[PDB]
Amino acid sequence: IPPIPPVDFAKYGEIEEVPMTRLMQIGATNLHRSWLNVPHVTQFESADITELEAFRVAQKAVAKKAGVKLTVLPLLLKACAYLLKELPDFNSSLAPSGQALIRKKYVHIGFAVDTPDGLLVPVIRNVDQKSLLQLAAEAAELAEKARSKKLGADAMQGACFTISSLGHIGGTAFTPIVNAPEVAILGVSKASMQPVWDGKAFQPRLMLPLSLSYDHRVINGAAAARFTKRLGDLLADIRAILL
Amino acid sequence: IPPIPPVDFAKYGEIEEVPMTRLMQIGATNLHRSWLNVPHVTQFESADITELEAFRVAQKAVAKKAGVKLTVLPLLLKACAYLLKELPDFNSSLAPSGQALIRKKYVHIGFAVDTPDGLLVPVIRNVDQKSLLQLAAEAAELAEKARSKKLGADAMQGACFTISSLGHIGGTAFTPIVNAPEVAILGVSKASMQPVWDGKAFQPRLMLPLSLSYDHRVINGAAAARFTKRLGDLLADIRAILL
Amino acid sequence: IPPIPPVDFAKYGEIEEVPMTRLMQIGATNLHRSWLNVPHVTQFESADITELEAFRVAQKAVAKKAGVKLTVLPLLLKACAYLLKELPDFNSSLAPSGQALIRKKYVHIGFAVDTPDGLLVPVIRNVDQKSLLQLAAEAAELAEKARSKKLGADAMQGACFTISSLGHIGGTAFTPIVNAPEVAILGVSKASMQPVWDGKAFQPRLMLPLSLSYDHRVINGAAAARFTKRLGDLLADIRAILL
């Protein structure tokens, strides 16, 4: 792969060399290994979370009595675990012989935490088996452990899918990079009030933007549009997870 | 190109190996060969098809009397063939000497059909010369042939451009991968009612989302925005194809 | 990197070979070198420029008295220079030892001009130090020099960031390719009137679509969402540049 010509950057003005933490360099290498290895496609969709938000906000009492803050993330984690069980090609990996996929029978999901030294993706194990407030607490713990360099590498391992949420900073949608050997990563952005046709007039609904990137070798376009559609359906009525 | 480290996936839970059809493996290889070879950009645009939909729906009688179902696809095929004639760099390919483009003087277009064994892209030849109901029928035939493994490889050959339509499952936009040695692929998603400024108030218009990925080596950014703009214009009034 | 199988294209119809200008071939090579080398992500955002447009239009008198046309580009250039100073990782480059970043202490920005022979990206030096009408004039000069093959290669050098504006042709958003060894490129598309929730009803605001692609090795997802958010904030009130 042809390298970039070196440029003498100080010919154009003052420069200064800051160095990279080992975590950024590790990060850097893994992403470039994902990028050259995975033919990426991104599927955009946005979900109606007007009702999910109201749920979230009404349960602020309960959540505080349990010491967890309830955010959208445990609600995202729960719906994607249901779905990763319904559509198992998403919960799997290409075997190194290129000719089989390892379907994992377990659901562990990581999520991106951006710390000072770099990106960490702590994994929550068997997300399918935990409740909203369990997930809430654990997510929170692992994030502080991650910020405070106290996350032992055991916890960065063997995830089946990654969620990257930037809803807290902003943006309309992005195209995340798959953490190979996983096969898909959900990027989530800022929710906004949007007019939505109700058959007669435009209603304001709160809409969460979602960006699913996938490994096109394993997941085709119709499988991915069916996954973000189902996910949009589950987030608009989380009670469907009950049945 | 550095390979992905092998992970022992059964350390984290129960796994199961399902194998890949030869069609998926073929599929897989061709996409990775496209991905490493084509510097991709995706241009998003959305077109006003309120009038095209009404046309489509009013001609349901005619279409049934001819045995074809009229969908948006023959209407997409016709407009892109007009346009592939107007903007010939889109209907062409990079010569293997990297220093010339083969402009094709013919317009054959394929479209993605996702079958059980994998993705097939049957080609309709000389789309420029067929009418809406001819195109309607043929598309339909090739798709059933494709589902039923009866599509002879002659029909997967020598296309100039690909349309991938996921409007039937959902999604807001995606970033398709170019089927090299073609130079562009139109991805089409779900149409929705959207408010559109009429200079004075917001009108509800039915808007089709379009995602053109292209080979940035051959097509520059301004050529691609001019192609989806023209396409948006042609779909809002298909009568412009007449003149 | 596996090559594309050669196809005999004249088996399917009449072909014609047109050749590539040296500028397209140069262009072609640089993009493929960027693509294989940079793990790309694109961050979408859109900014409220209703007030910026009114400013622009009210100062048409002044601009004409100075001989410059005031467009959105000098306003984009100014806000990104402020911001490139606030978020210096965006104004920097990966050292060839892969383990340090060269932070540039200067702000020179290029912008894409698509000419007949190919894409040129003239650079305006020390954009941070020039005013709106200086920037206006210079941009304009360099563009005509670029169209007329009179741009000496000195002017295509040592830029820290690229803006590619296609707002003049159309489109909703695109995913530009980073001009390595730069680390980010802002793509800008067509502004449209959009309903925006004001807490009580939907107001029509003029919204500029922005698409920031970045080198994920150097910039993480949260840094990029913070850059397009800040940029959206600066374009909605350019007076913040004053303080």
Swiss-Prot record, chains A, B, C:
Active site per database record: 216
Region of interest (Catalytic), ranges: 1-243
Superkingdom of the source species: Bacteria
Subunit structure: Forms a 24-polypeptide structural core with octahedral symmetry.
Function noted in UniProt: The pyruvate dehydrogenase complex catalyzes the overall conversion of pyruvate to acetyl-CoA and CO(2). It contains multiple copies of three enzymatic components: pyruvate dehydrogenase (E1), dihydrolipoamide acetyltransferase (E2) and lipoamide dehydrogenase (E3).
Family the UniProt entry places it in: Belongs to the 2-oxoacid dehydrogenase family.
Protein name as catalogued: Dihydrolipoyllysine-residue acetyltransferase component of pyruvate dehydrogenase complex
